[PDB]
Amino acid sequence: PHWLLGNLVSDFVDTFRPTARINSICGRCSLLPVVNWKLDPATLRFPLKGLLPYDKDLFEPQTALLRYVLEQPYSRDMVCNMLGLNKQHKQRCPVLEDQLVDLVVYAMERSETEEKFDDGGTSQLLWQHLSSQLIFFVLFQFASFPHMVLSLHQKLAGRGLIKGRDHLMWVLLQFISGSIQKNALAD
Amino acid sequence: LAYVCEWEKWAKSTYCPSLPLACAWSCRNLIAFTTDLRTHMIHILDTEHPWEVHSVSSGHSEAITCLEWDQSGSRLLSADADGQIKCWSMADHLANSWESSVGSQVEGDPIVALSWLHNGVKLALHVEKSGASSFGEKFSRVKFSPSLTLFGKPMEGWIAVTVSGLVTVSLLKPSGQVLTSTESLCRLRGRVALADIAFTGGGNIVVAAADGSSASPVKFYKVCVSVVSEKCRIDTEILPSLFMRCTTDPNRKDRFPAITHLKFLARDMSEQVLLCATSSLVECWSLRKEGLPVNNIFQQQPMILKWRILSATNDLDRVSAVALPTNTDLKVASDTQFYPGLGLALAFQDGSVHMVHRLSLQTMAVFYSKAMQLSWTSLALVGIDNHGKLSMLRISPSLGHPLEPKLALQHLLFLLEYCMVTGYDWWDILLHVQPGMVQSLVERLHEEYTRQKPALQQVLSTRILAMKASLCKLSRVCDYHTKLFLMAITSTLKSLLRPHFLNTPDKSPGDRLAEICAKITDVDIDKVMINLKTEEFVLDMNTLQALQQLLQWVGDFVLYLLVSLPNQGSPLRPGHSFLRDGTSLGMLRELMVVIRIWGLLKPSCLPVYTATSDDSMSLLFRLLTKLWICCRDEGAASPASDGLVSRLQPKQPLRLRFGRAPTLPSSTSTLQLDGLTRAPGLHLGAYPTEECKACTRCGCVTMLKSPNKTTAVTQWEQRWIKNCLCGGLWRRVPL
Amino acid sequence: VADVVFVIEGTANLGPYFEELRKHYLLPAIEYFNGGPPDFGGDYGGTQYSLVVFNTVDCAPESYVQCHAPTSSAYEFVTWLDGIKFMSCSLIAEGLSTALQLFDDFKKMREQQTHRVCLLICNSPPYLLPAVESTTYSGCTTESLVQKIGERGIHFSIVSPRKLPALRLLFEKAAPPALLEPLQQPADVSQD
Amino acid sequence: LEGTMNLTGEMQPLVEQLMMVKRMQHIPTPLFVLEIWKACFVGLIESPEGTQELKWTAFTYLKIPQVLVKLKKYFHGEKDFTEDVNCAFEFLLKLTPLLDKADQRCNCDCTNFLLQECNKQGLLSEVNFASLVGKRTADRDPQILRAEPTVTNILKTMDADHSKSPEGLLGVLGHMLSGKSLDLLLAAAAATGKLKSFARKFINLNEFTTHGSGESTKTASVRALLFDISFLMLCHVAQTYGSEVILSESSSGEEVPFFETWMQTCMPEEGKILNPDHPCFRPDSTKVESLVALLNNSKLVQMKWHEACLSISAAILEILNAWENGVLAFESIQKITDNIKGKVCSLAVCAVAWLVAHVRMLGLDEREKSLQMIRQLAGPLYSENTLQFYNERVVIMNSILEHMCADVLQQTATQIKFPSTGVDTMPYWNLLPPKRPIKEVLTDIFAKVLEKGWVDSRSIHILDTLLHMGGVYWFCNNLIKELLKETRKEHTLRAVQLLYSIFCLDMQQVTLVLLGHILPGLLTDSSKWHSLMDPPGTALAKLAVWCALSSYSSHKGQASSRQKKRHREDIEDYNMRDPLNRVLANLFLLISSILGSRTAGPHTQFVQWFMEECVGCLEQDSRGSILQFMPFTTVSELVKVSPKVVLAITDLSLPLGRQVAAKAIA
C-alpha cells in the first residue's frame, strides 16, 4: 500500500483476517472422485469472499486438482462443466493448454523411467490412455501453436525424453492423421 | 604521475562502508572502472586523448570482475551473472548499447571472464636483434590449439567459475546469438575465492582456489569443452592439490589469500598471494612435472604432477592484476635490455606500488606513487589504487635504469613493429625519448620496413603512414605530420576510385591503364586521353555522386600544392606541404586524367573555383606535368614553372580543411585533468557553419557524419564504419 | 548431393553491388540444389551447404575468419546471407584456405561424392601475398588453387561482379575441368 | 538451534539469549515455558533417526537445569515458578496428540514422560502438581527392556563414578559395559558437566599409558587393548563433536598428549595439502626400520607405543613400493593383515592420514583406494589369537569411526567400499543437489519455513552449509530480498521472528555485516527506497534493532564450524574502537543524516518506525559518551520531526540530559 498509509491499513487487514479465516474449509487437497458446486474455478481462483483470506492456497492456481482430474479417464465432461461451455466459440486457448503441456511433460518424464521396464508393466498402459484422452480433448491445442512449441521449449532442458519420444510421436500421429485435411500444413 | 584525472562532483558516501573495484583491458580503450561513487555504472574511455568519459548505466549489481577477450568491443559484466557481453558497433564507442547475450545464475558469484580464442604469438626478440629480423624472426608465431573449433573457426564463449558454488559458466554463441548454456558442479560442492589460470597447450581449462591458506586445498578442475550437437559436455577432471608455503613455515601462521592470480601460462605459472592481516607474503608456484621417488623401503610410472615453490617475499601486498597482457622463454641472454619482459606490477595500500619481475620475484624499481593492470607490454600502470576516488596513474613505459640511446631506439622500434604486426594500437609515445630519438628512429624503422617487406608493404602502407605521422608528431615536425595524413587520404582515394570501375571487357585490367599512362605527353591532357583510352571509363550515368562533393577535394588540393611552391620563404620548411617524392605527384596526375574523363562524360566536373579560365583543368594539368617531369626518377627539380605558378587567375580560392589532430603533450612532469571540463594547454559536406547533425567524430581528425545523406557513395561509408587510420575508435560528440 | 560451400569476399570491397548479384544468382543457390526457398529441418542427407565470409586486412586487428555454417538446413542459409555486415589486398588466400579445410573435413566426414561446388565471390580483384599465417595450411594463391583443383573436382566457379579484371585470367588456372572462367550474365546454369 | 548445533556452553549464553528475546516480545511466563517445552518435545520426534535420539534425550534432560538456573536468576519474587510452570504444563497437557506421538516414537515414552515430569519436580513443588500429572496419565486411557529416557536418567549418575581408580590392571569390565551397550558418554557430555571432565581424564589415561617396559605377554595384551579402546573412544567423541574435546584437552597450560590425530588427522576441514611435510612428522631415524621389520615379520611383546604417529612414514614407503616400484605387488596385501587385524587399532590414523594424502594428490590410477579398502576391510576375523575381548565391538567401533571420515573423499572417486556395515549411516550431510544454483533457500527452504514455522530442524543444517559455502553478505541480502515480498503483517512478523533465530551462531559477524552494509544501501539508493515503503519495513527495523541489542552483549557465541572460518581481517572502512562499536556509530550517524530534510517519503517513515521499535526496556544502545555523541542531538532532531524523548532522557545523568529535557519541555 501507498507510502502515506503505513501500519494502519496493514494492521486493519490483520485484525480482519480472522473474519475471512472463519470462511475457510481446509487445505483443499482433492475433491473430485466422480466422473458422471464444489471446485469449479473460473481462472486459477475459485473463491468468492472479498475479504483477506490466508496464504495463496486460495489464490494460487488449483493445479494439483486439475492434474488429478485430467489424469482420470472420462473426465472430459468434468473439466468442461468445471469451466468450459461450447469451446468452439468461447475457449480462446486458455491456460488449460499450459496445464495439458505440463501433463504431457510429466507423462514423458514418468515414461522415462524405463516405461515400466520397457513397456512390460502397466505404466505405458496408463500413458497411452492418458494421452489418448488428452488428444480427444485436444480440439484447440495447436490453435495458438505456441502451446505446441512450449512442449519443445520445456523438453529442451533435461533431455530425458530419449526413450519416450516414440510415444510423443504416437500421440502426434493420433492427432494429425485425423486433423491433416482440416488444418493447413504450415500450422 | 602522468594523466592523473579526478572526479568532479561525486564522493564515497562516508556511511557506506566500501565496494570492490576491478578493471582490466588488453586492447585499447582501457577503461571499465567499477567504482563506488555517490550496481554503479561502468566507465569507458579510449586513452588516446579521451578525457571526457561516457559512463553507461550498468544492468546488474556490484560488477565484480572484468577482463576483455580481444580487440573487438566486448564487456564482461559479472557479479550475479546478469547483463553480460555486448558489442557496441552502433554509431561509435560512445554508445555501449548493452545487448542480449547474458547468461544466468541464480544468486551466483561469477569471478572469471575467459575463453582464449586464437593462437598466441611468440616474440623471439632476444635472438632477433633486428638484423635478420625480416619480420619473421623478430615476431614469430607459435602453433596453438583453439578451444572446441568446429570443422575451421574457434567459436568462443566466456567459460567461467562462480564463487557462490564452484560449478561452471557456459554459453558460447556462434552465428546466431544461440545461448546453449549448462552447469556441472565440480564434484558437487565447494567454496571458492579463486582466479582462473585459463588455457594449457591443447584445449583445456584449469582453475582452483577454495578457502584460505591456513588450510588451503586447491582442486584443479580440468574441464573439456568438446561439446555435443548442442549439449555442453564439460567434465570435472581433478588434478593434484597444493598449499601455501606460509603454513609449513613455523615462524608465522597468518597468510589468508585474497587475490591469487595465475597467468595464462598454464604450465609453469601459479602466483597465489597471501593476503595476511600489516604484511602480505607473495609466492609463485610452479606447475612442474615430476616422478615419485619410490625408495628407502628396500634394496630393490613417471606420469604424476606436482606443484613446487619458485620464490617468495616478505612484505605488505594488496593489489595485482596481470604480468604482461607476451614475452619470451628460457635461454634469454638479454641483460642490458631490462624492457618489460617477464615483469609483474603489484600495489600496496600502505604507501606506493612495487614492480616485480616474474620467475624470480626478487625485486625491481619501486616508482613511488584497487586495480592495477598493465596497459600493454610497455610499463603503463593504471592508478585506481585507493586513497579516495582517485583516477588513473601511469609510469615510465620503458624500464631502463642505465641509459643507452641505441638500445632504447631498438626497443622502441621493436614495440612499434609489434603493434604493427599484431594490429594493436600503440601507446609507446610515452616511452620515446626527447626528439633526439624521434626522426632517426622512424627513419631506420621505415627503412627496415620497406627493405624486408617483400610484398608486405602493399598491405602495411595504410598503417605505416599513420604510425610515422604519429611518431613525428611528438616534438616542430608537425609539418611532416600533416604531410603523411594528406598522402594517406589521397592514396586511399586513388585506391578506392579504381575498383569503382564497372567497365567493359579489356585486354588486361583496364584500371591499370590509368597507371600505365605515365609515359605520355606533358601538356594538353586532351591528347593524352585519346592516346591511352576513352571508351571504357564510364561506369554509371549517375556520376552525380562524388564529383561535386568529393572530387572537389583533389581539385582544391592540386591548387593549394601549386600555390605553396613559390612561397618556400615562408617560416616553415614545406610551408604547409612539400610532396617532392614524385609517386604521389604521379597518382595526382592519374587522378587528374580520370577526373578529366569524368568531366568530359558528365557536366558535373570540378569547378573552375570561380570562373573565367578562357579550360582551368588544362592549365592545372600542364603545371602538374611540368612539376612531375623533373620528379620522376632521380632528377633535380625546379624556371618558367616558378613564374607560371606566380600568376593567379580570377579563380583561386584558399582555406582548405587539412584535417589535423590535437596532441597530448604531457611532457615530463605531471598532469591534472578532470572527469569533464576538458583542459586546454571530413569534407563530404561534414561541416556546415554550425553543427546540426550526428557528427560522429573519430580518434584523430575525421569528424564525419553518421548517415551522410547520400545514395550511392556508401563505399566510403563502409570503408570508414570499421577501424580507421589509427582512429578506428569512432566517437560521438553532441552539437 | 548438393554439397556446396560459398565464399563471400566482396563484403567490404563493394557493399551495394551485393544485392545486384544476389537478385540474379539466388536461384542457383537454392532453386537448383532444392525445390525453392520456403521452414524445414536439416540432417545428414548431404544437401547441407556452408558460407564463409571475409573482409579486408585494414578492418581486421584480430577478426579474420567467420566461417559459420555447419549445415544451414537449406533455409537459414539465405536467412543469415542478408544478415552479415559490410565492413586492395583483401586476403583472398587465407579466405580460401579455410574453405579448402572445410572441404577436407567434408570429404573426411561424408564417407557414405556429391559434386561439390564453391563460389569465390570477390568484388574487388584483390591478392594476398602471405599464404595463410593464420591456419594449419601454408600455401600461396597458386598452391591453394592447384590444390583445390587437383584434389577436389569441385566446380571452382568465380562469381565476380560485372567487371572483368585480370583476376579471372589467373584464377581460371584449374587444370581439371572445373569451369573457373564463367561470369554468367545470361540465364542461370547448373554449376559453372 | 541450541540443541542441534551445539551441546556444551551452558554458563548462561542460551539463558542470556532467551532473556533478551523475552524482553523485546510478548513475555508471559506461561507462554515462554510452553514455547521452550514445545521446542524441547518437537525435537527427538521428527529430527533424529538413529543415534541422534540418544543426544536429543540428553538435551531434553539438560533443558531443565537451564530453566532451573533461569528461575533462580531471572525471576525473583513474582510468581516464583510455582504457578506459571503449572499453568504452562496445563497449557501443554492440553495438547494431547503431540504427547501421544512423542510416546509413540519412543514406543515406551509414556512412563518415561511420567518419570520426566516428576523429574522436573526439582523446580515444581510436589504439593498438588503431581496430581496434575496423574490426571494427564488418566487421560492416556489406552496406554521391552527399558525406555531410553529412563536409561539416560539412570546413567546420569554413572558419570560421577566413571573410572575413579587410577591404578594398573584397571577393570576391563568398565570398558566392556560401555563399548557393548549404548554410548551413555554422549549423554553425559550433553549434560554439560562431563564432556570437559571426561575427555580430560580420558586423554590423561592415554597420555599416561607409556608403561615404560613390560615383561608379561598378558599384561602387554592388556595395555594394548586398553590403549586401543581409549584411543578409539576418544577419536569417536572427537568425530561426534570435535572442538569440545580438543578444547578440553588444551584449555589451559601446556602438556604433551597425542594431539597428532586430534588436530591434523581428520575433521570437518581438510588440513591435508600442508599436512605431509612439516605437520606429519615422518622421522626415518629409528622409526622406519622398526616399522618395516614389524610389517615384514607377519608381536606386541615389547611394549612401546609411539609408532602410531610414525605409521604415516610406513604408509608412504609402502604405497609407492607397492604400486610404483614393482618389487612388491601383493606382499602389501599380506602385510596389511599384520596390522589391520587384532592387537592393533592404529589403522584409523593411517587411513585418515592417507585419505588426506589422496585428497591432495591426483590419484588418477586410484591405486591407493585398493589398499585403503583392504585396510578398512573386516576380512580378518581374528585369525591370530590376539586376546582383546572385543573382537567384534572394537572392530565395529573402528569401522564406524573410519566411515565418519573419508566421506567427502570417496565422493570425489568411485563408490565407497562400505566399511562401516552398521544399522544406519550418518544422518547429517550436505544433501545438496549436484547441478543446482545455490539460490534455493528462497525457492524451497525459506518459502517453506515461512509456513512451516518451527525452523525444520533438518533444514538448519542446510542453512549452515549454505552460509559457510557462500558468503554472509549475499546470504543476508537474498534473505532480505525474500522477506521484502510478503505484503502481510503476520507473515512479516513470523519472518523476522524466525530470522532473528536463524541468525544465531553468527550473531556478531552477520549482524555487523548485514546492518552496516544493507541498511546504508537500503537508505542511500533510489530503488532501495521503493522496497522499504512496505509494512515489511517495520519488521525489518525490528529485526535490525533486535540483532543490534543481541550482538551488543559480549557473549562467546562460538559456533562449531564458524570459530575457524571467521579468521579474516578488515579495518571496516570507517567506548572504544571495535567493529560492532564502530558499526553502531555508523548506523546512528546514518540515522541522524536520514533526518536530512527537504526530500524523503519512505526513509523518514522507516527511521520513525526504527526509533519507535528501539523504544523499549532493557536497552543498551544509544552508546552515549559524555563528550560529543550525536545520538542525543539526533534525538532532539527527531523530536523536532513524548515518552520517545524520555527514552534517552537521563542516560549519563550529565548536562547532556538537560538538553533533551529542554527539548521535551518545548
Swiss-Prot record, chain A:
Question: In terms of domain of life, where is this protein from?
Answer: Eukaryota
- List localization entries: Nucleus
User: Subunit notes for this chain?
Assistant: Component of the Mediator complex, which is composed of MED1, MED4, MED6, MED7, MED8, MED9, MED10, MED11, MED12, MED13, MED13L, MED14, MED15, MED16, MED17, MED18, MED19, MED20, MED21, MED22, MED23, MED24, MED25, MED26, MED27, MED29, MED30, MED31, CCNC, CDK8 and CDC2L6/CDK11. The MED12, MED13, CCNC and CDK8 subunits form a distinct module termed the CDK8 module. Mediator containing the CDK8 module is less active than Mediator lacking this module in supporting transcriptional activation.
State the family named in the UniProt similarity comment for this chain. Answer: Belongs to the Mediator complex subunit 23 family.
Q: Function of this protein?
A: Component of the Mediator complex, a coactivator involved in the regulated transcription of nearly all RNA polymerase II-dependent genes. Mediator functions as a bridge to convey information from gene-specific regulatory proteins to the basal RNA polymerase II transcription machinery. Mediator is recruited to promoters by direct interactions with regulatory proteins and serves as a scaffold for the assembly of a functional pre-initiation complex with RNA polymerase II and the general transcription factors.
What this protein is called in its record is Mediator of RNA polymerase II transcription subunit 23
Tell me the organism: Mus musculus
Q: Which gene encodes it?
A: Med23
Question: Coverage of the whole protein, first to last residue?
Answer: 197 to 391 of 1367
From Swiss-Prot, chain B:
What InterPro entries does the record tag this protein with?
A: MED16_bridge, Mediator_Med16, Mediator_Med16_C, Mediator_Med16_N, Quinoprot_gluc/sorb_DH_b-prop, WD40/YVTN_repeat-like_dom_sf, WD40_repeat_dom_sf, WD40_rpt
Quote one Gene Ontology molecular function term: transcription coactivator activity
| Organism domain of life | Eukaryota
Q: Which Gene3D superfamilies match?
A: YVTN repeat-like/Quinoprotein amine dehydrogenase (2.130.10.10)
Intervals holding WD repeats: 59-98, 189-231, 254-295, 567-608, 687-726
PROSITE patterns tied to this protein:
WD_REPEATS_2 (PS50082), WD_REPEATS_REGION (PS50294)
Pfam families from the UniProt entry: Med16_bridge, Med16_C, Med16_N, WD40
| Subcellular localization(s) per the UniProt record | Nucleus
| GO BP term, pick one | RNA polymerase II preinitiation complex assembly
Q: Quote a single Gene Ontology cellular component term.
A: nucleoplasm
Coarse class of the primary localization is nucleus
This protein's UniProt keywords: Activator, Nucleus, Repeat, Transcription, Transcription regulation, WD repeat
- Write out the similarity annotation: Belongs to the Mediator complex subunit 16 family.
Q: What does this protein do?
A: Component of the Mediator complex, a coactivator involved in the regulated transcription of nearly all RNA polymerase II-dependent genes. Mediator functions as a bridge to convey information from gene-specific regulatory proteins to the basal RNA polymerase II transcription machinery. Mediator is recruited to promoters by direct interactions with regulatory proteins and serves as a scaffold for the assembly of a functional preinitiation complex with RNA polymerase II and the general transcription factors.
Q: What is this protein called?
A: Mediator of RNA polymerase II transcription subunit 16
Curated annotation (Swiss-Prot), chain C:
Where does it live in the cell? Nucleus
Biological processes annotated in GO: positive regulation of transcription by RNA polymerase II; positive regulation of transcription elongation by RNA polymerase II; positive regulation of transcription initiation by RNA polymerase II; RNA polymerase II preinitiation complex assembly; transcription by RNA polymerase II
Q: Which GO terms describe its molecular function?
A: nuclear retinoic acid receptor binding; nuclear retinoid X receptor binding
Assigned GO CC terms: core mediator complex; nucleoplasm; nucleus; transcription regulator complex
Principal localization? nucleus
Domain of life here? Eukaryota
TM spans (from-to) = none
Q: Where is this region: Interaction with the Mediator complex?
A: 1-192
Query: What keywords appear on the UniProt entry?
Result: Activator, Methylation, Nucleus, Transcription, Transcription regulation
Q: Into which family does the record put it?
A: Belongs to the Mediator complex subunit 25 family.
Q: What does this protein do?
A: Component of the Mediator complex, a coactivator involved in the regulated transcription of nearly all RNA polymerase II-dependent genes. Mediator functions as a bridge to convey information from gene-specific regulatory proteins to the basal RNA polymerase II transcription machinery. Mediator is recruited to promoters by direct interactions with regulatory proteins and serves as a scaffold for the assembly of a functional preinitiation complex with RNA polymerase II and the general transcription factors. Required for RARA/RXRA-mediated transcription.
The protein in question is named Mediator of RNA polymerase II transcription subunit 25
Query: What is the species listed in this Swiss-Prot or TrEMBL entry?
Result: Mus musculus (Mouse)
The gene from which this protein is expressed is: Med25
From Swiss-Prot, chain D:
Entry GO terms, CC: core mediator complex; mediator complex; nucleoplasm; nucleus
Q: Report the family membership.
A: Belongs to the Mediator complex subunit 24 family.
Claim: Phosphoprotein is one of the keywords in the record: yes
Q: Where is this motif: LXXLL motif 5?
A: 519-523
**The encoding gene:** Med24
Task: Supply the name of the protein.
Answer: Mediator of RNA polymerase II transcription subunit 24
Keyword line: Activator, Nucleus, Phosphoprotein, Repeat, Transcription, Transcription regulation
* Tissue localization of expression: Expressed in the adrenal gland, brain, epididymis, heart, kidney, liver, ovary, pancreas, prostate, skeletal muscle, small intestine, spleen, stomach, testis and thymus.
Per the UniProt entry, what is one GO biological process? Answer: positive regulation of transcription initiation by RNA polymerase II
Residue window of motif LXXLL motif 2: 95-99
Record has Nucleus as a keyword: yes
- A GO molecular-function descriptor: transcription coactivator activity
Query: The motif LXXLL motif 3: which residues?
Result: 182-186
Motif stretch (LXXLL motif 4): 291-295
**What role is this protein assigned?**
Component of the Mediator complex, a coactivator involved in the regulated transcription of nearly all RNA polymerase II-dependent genes. Mediator functions as a bridge to convey information from gene-specific regulatory proteins to the basal RNA polymerase II transcription machinery. Mediator is recruited to promoters by direct interactions with regulatory proteins and serves as a scaffold for the assembly of a functional preinitiation complex with RNA polymerase II and the general transcription factors. Required for basal and activator-dependent transcription.
Q: Tell me where it resides.
A: Nucleus
